[PDB]
Design a protein around this ligand. Sequence first.
Ligand code: HEC
Length: 81
Amino acid sequence: ADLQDAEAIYNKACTVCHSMGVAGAPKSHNTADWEPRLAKGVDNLVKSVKTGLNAMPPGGMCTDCTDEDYKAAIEFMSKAK
Ligand code: HEC
């Protein structure tokens, strides 16, 4: 796919699960779901993404993804997760 826009990255990748909340995924736009993430910081969740959590593919479903577009994508939502 395409690594030009944080919006395009989340909207194509963090979309299957997080858009509706399928597989128990936490929402794109919550406050209480992001609170216990923003309490640590930002670049702590980018890691659990690149690593692939249990129900989550390694890379968060992106292959060639750089921390730049990665974090921009996390911060497009609510700068935690
Ligand atoms: C379904 C195939 C998913 C895709 C695609 C992405 N995510 Fe995801 N995410 C999913 C689930 C079911 C969960 C687990 C919720 C639980 O607590 O059981 C998550 C969780 C996260 C988290 C939070 C991890 C934590 O600290 O608990 C983050 C940081 C997150 N997801 C980010 C993220 C991004 C940025 C993705 C696109 C690149 C992405 N996820 C894709 C399911 C799915």
